[PDB]
Design a protein around this motif. Structure first.
Motif, PDB file in Angstrom:
ATOM      1  N   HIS A   1       0.816  -1.214   0.000  1.00  0.00           N
ATOM      2  CA  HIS A   1       0.000   0.000   0.000  1.00  0.00           C
ATOM      3  C   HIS A   1       0.853   1.270   0.000  1.00  0.00           C
ATOM      4  O   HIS A   1       0.952   1.910  -1.020  1.00  0.00           O
ATOM      5  CB  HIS A   1      -1.096   0.083   1.078  1.00  0.00           C
ATOM      6  CG  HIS A   1      -2.256   0.902   0.592  1.00  0.00           C
ATOM      7  ND1 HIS A   1      -2.272   2.266   0.751  1.00  0.00           N
ATOM      8  CD2 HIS A   1      -3.369   0.557  -0.117  1.00  0.00           C
ATOM      9  CE1 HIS A   1      -3.382   2.709   0.187  1.00  0.00           C
ATOM     10  NE2 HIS A   1      -4.044   1.692  -0.363  1.00  0.00           N
ATOM     11  N   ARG A   2       1.562   1.597   1.050  1.00  0.00           N
ATOM     12  CA  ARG A   2       2.481   2.713   1.042  1.00  0.00           C
ATOM     13  C   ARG A   2       3.584   2.516   0.003  1.00  0.00           C
ATOM     14  O   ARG A   2       3.967   3.462  -0.646  1.00  0.00           O
ATOM     15  CB  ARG A   2       3.126   2.890   2.426  1.00  0.00           C
ATOM     16  CG  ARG A   2       3.938   4.185   2.554  1.00  0.00           C
ATOM     17  CD  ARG A   2       5.011   4.164   3.588  1.00  0.00           C
ATOM     18  NE  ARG A   2       6.176   3.316   3.330  1.00  0.00           N
ATOM     19  CZ  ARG A   2       6.919   2.909   4.356  1.00  0.00           C
ATOM     20  NH1 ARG A   2       6.471   2.964   5.604  1.00  0.00           N
ATOM     21  NH2 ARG A   2       8.186   2.586   4.190  1.00  0.00           N
ATOM     22  N   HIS A   3       4.062   1.294  -0.232  1.00  0.00           N
ATOM     23  CA  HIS A   3       5.015   1.005  -1.287  1.00  0.00           C
ATOM     24  C   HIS A   3       4.387   1.153  -2.658  1.00  0.00           C
ATOM     25  O   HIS A   3       4.947   1.852  -3.508  1.00  0.00           O
ATOM     26  CB  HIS A   3       5.700  -0.352  -1.113  1.00  0.00           C
ATOM     27  CG  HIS A   3       6.808  -0.308  -0.092  1.00  0.00           C
ATOM     28  ND1 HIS A   3       7.719   0.723   0.031  1.00  0.00           N
ATOM     29  CD2 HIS A   3       7.113  -1.200   0.864  1.00  0.00           C
ATOM     30  CE1 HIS A   3       8.518   0.447   1.042  1.00  0.00           C
ATOM     31  NE2 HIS A   3       8.154  -0.699   1.584  1.00  0.00           N
ATOM     32  N   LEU A   4       3.208   0.581  -2.850  1.00  0.00           N
ATOM     33  CA  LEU A   4       2.537   0.694  -4.142  1.00  0.00           C
ATOM     34  C   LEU A   4       2.185   2.148  -4.504  1.00  0.00           C
ATOM     35  O   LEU A   4       2.272   2.557  -5.642  1.00  0.00           O
ATOM     36  CB  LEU A   4       1.263  -0.126  -4.166  1.00  0.00           C
ATOM     37  CG  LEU A   4       1.483  -1.612  -4.113  1.00  0.00           C
ATOM     38  CD1 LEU A   4       0.103  -2.241  -3.960  1.00  0.00           C
ATOM     39  CD2 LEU A   4       2.253  -2.021  -5.364  1.00  0.00           C
ATOM     40  N   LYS A   5       1.811   2.938  -3.517  1.00  0.00           N
ATOM     41  CA  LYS A   5       1.483   4.340  -3.663  1.00  0.00           C
ATOM     42  C   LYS A   5       2.685   5.161  -4.106  1.00  0.00           C
ATOM     43  O   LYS A   5       2.507   6.355  -4.332  1.00  0.00           O
ATOM     44  CB  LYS A   5       1.027   4.845  -2.281  1.00  0.00           C
ATOM     45  CG  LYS A   5       0.094   6.042  -2.186  1.00  0.00           C
ATOM     46  CD  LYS A   5      -1.233   5.720  -2.844  1.00  0.00           C
ATOM     47  CE  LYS A   5      -2.502   6.314  -2.282  1.00  0.00           C
ATOM     48  NZ  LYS A   5      -2.497   7.727  -2.631  1.00  0.00           N
ATOM     49  N   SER A   6       3.881   4.553  -4.228  1.00  0.00           N
ATOM     50  CA  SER A   6       5.075   5.209  -4.739  1.00  0.00           C
ATOM     51  C   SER A   6       5.478   4.674  -6.122  1.00  0.00           C
ATOM     52  O   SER A   6       6.554   5.044  -6.619  1.00  0.00           O
ATOM     53  CB  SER A   6       6.234   5.108  -3.768  1.00  0.00           C
ATOM     54  OG  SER A   6       6.825   3.810  -3.785  1.00  0.00           O
ATOM     55  N   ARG A   7       4.619   3.848  -6.759  1.00  0.00           N
ATOM     56  CA  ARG A   7       4.850   3.259  -8.073  1.00  0.00           C
ATOM     57  C   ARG A   7       3.543   3.305  -8.882  1.00  0.00           C
ATOM     58  O   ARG A   7       3.004   2.257  -9.244  1.00  0.00           O
ATOM     59  CB  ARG A   7       5.364   1.819  -7.915  1.00  0.00           C
ATOM     60  CG  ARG A   7       6.712   1.764  -7.202  1.00  0.00           C
ATOM     61  CD  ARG A   7       7.396   0.434  -7.214  1.00  0.00           C
ATOM     62  NE  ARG A   7       8.444   0.392  -6.187  1.00  0.00           N
ATOM     63  CZ  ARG A   7       9.742   0.409  -6.435  1.00  0.00           C
ATOM     64  NH1 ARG A   7      10.178   0.706  -7.648  1.00  0.00           N
ATOM     65  NH2 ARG A   7      10.592   0.051  -5.488  1.00  0.00           N
ATOM     66  N   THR A   8       3.024   4.512  -9.192  1.00  0.00           N
ATOM     67  CA  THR A   8       1.582   4.652  -9.388  1.00  0.00           C
ATOM     68  C   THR A   8       1.153   5.691 -10.427  1.00  0.00           C
ATOM     69  O   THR A   8       0.014   6.139 -10.342  1.00  0.00           O
ATOM     70  CB  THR A   8       0.998   4.935  -7.991  1.00  0.00           C
ATOM     71  OG1 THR A   8      -0.370   4.530  -7.929  1.00  0.00           O
ATOM     72  CG2 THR A   8       1.130   6.369  -7.477  1.00  0.00           C
ATOM     73  N   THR A   9       1.981   6.025 -11.434  1.00  0.00           N
ATOM     74  CA  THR A   9       1.648   7.063 -12.421  1.00  0.00           C
ATOM     75  C   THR A   9       1.495   8.424 -11.711  1.00  0.00           C
ATOM     76  O   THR A   9       2.490   8.996 -11.286  1.00  0.00           O
ATOM     77  CB  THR A   9       0.420   6.641 -13.262  1.00  0.00           C
ATOM     78  OG1 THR A   9       0.614   5.359 -13.866  1.00  0.00           O
ATOM     79  CG2 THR A   9       0.097   7.585 -14.416  1.00  0.00           C
ATOM     80  N   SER A  10       0.246   8.912 -11.537  1.00  0.00           N
ATOM     81  CA  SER A  10      -0.090  10.106 -10.758  1.00  0.00           C
ATOM     82  C   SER A  10      -1.400   9.903  -9.967  1.00  0.00           C
ATOM     83  O   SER A  10      -2.079  10.879  -9.659  1.00  0.00           O
ATOM     84  CB  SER A  10      -0.206  11.341 -11.647  1.00  0.00           C
ATOM     85  OG  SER A  10       0.904  11.495 -12.524  1.00  0.00           O
ATOM     86  N   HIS A  11      -1.753   8.641  -9.621  1.00  0.00           N
ATOM     87  CA  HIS A  11      -3.104   8.234  -9.227  1.00  0.00           C
ATOM     88  C   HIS A  11      -3.138   7.166  -8.108  1.00  0.00           C
ATOM     89  O   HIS A  11      -2.119   6.605  -7.742  1.00  0.00           O
ATOM     90  CB  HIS A  11      -3.838   7.764 -10.489  1.00  0.00           C
ATOM     91  CG  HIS A  11      -4.008   8.824 -11.550  1.00  0.00           C
ATOM     92  ND1 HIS A  11      -4.758   9.982 -11.435  1.00  0.00           N
ATOM     93  CD2 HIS A  11      -3.526   8.848 -12.798  1.00  0.00           C
ATOM     94  CE1 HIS A  11      -4.682  10.683 -12.561  1.00  0.00           C
ATOM     95  NE2 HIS A  11      -3.933  10.012 -13.403  1.00  0.00           N
TER      96      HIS A  11
END
Length: 50
Positions: free
Chosen positions: A19-29
């Motif tokens: 979640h916090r990791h994925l939120k840093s690999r996410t286009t702009s969304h």
DNA sequence: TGCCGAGGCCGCTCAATTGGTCGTAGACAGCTCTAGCACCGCTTAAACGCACGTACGCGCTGTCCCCCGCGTTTTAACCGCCAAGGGGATTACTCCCTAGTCTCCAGGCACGTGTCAGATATATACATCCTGTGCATGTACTCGGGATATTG
């Protein structure tokens, strides 16, 4: 008393550090909360095969 | 001797490449789109890059001390070869079947819009989980001596 989201999924691995990791690999969304609970348990589950 | 037999040089005829010329058909370049919606210019209040001792962590440094490298040659068969045999990969033909073309024909669904919701983001308070630290044993290790396995 705070719970932990790992316990609601039934997982040993950290569902909220993901979640916090994925939120840093996410286009702009953004990223759905129900992603961390089948993101994890498809990283655990390789452990307990490896 | 002989004869001739065997011997060595030069125009037909056919069969791929090579380059040339004919004519015609979509497909390319270009125009005008026009049309519109992105690029730009113009502000704003904004985040995040960046030029800059010092604590100090560790990259690099001067020593000695030994195996694995370094050197030799015997041999050992590995690896190469050639030549023969058999077939199976190959060639050229005839019959055959469908690949491909076009044409008609429908509706499946991929396409598109029309609304607006359950979604997830963001804040503040916060408690808790998780890291960094410090800290015993327990094992996986290195060694020595003997048993079992296997090479020549």
């Amino acid at each position: 008393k705070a719970v932990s989201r790992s316990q609601r999924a039934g997982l040993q691995f950290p569902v909220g550090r993901i979640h916090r990791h994925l939120k840093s690999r996410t286009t702009s969304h953004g990223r759905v909360g129900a992603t961390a609970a089948v993101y994890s348990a498809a990283i655990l589950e390789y452990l307990t095969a490896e």
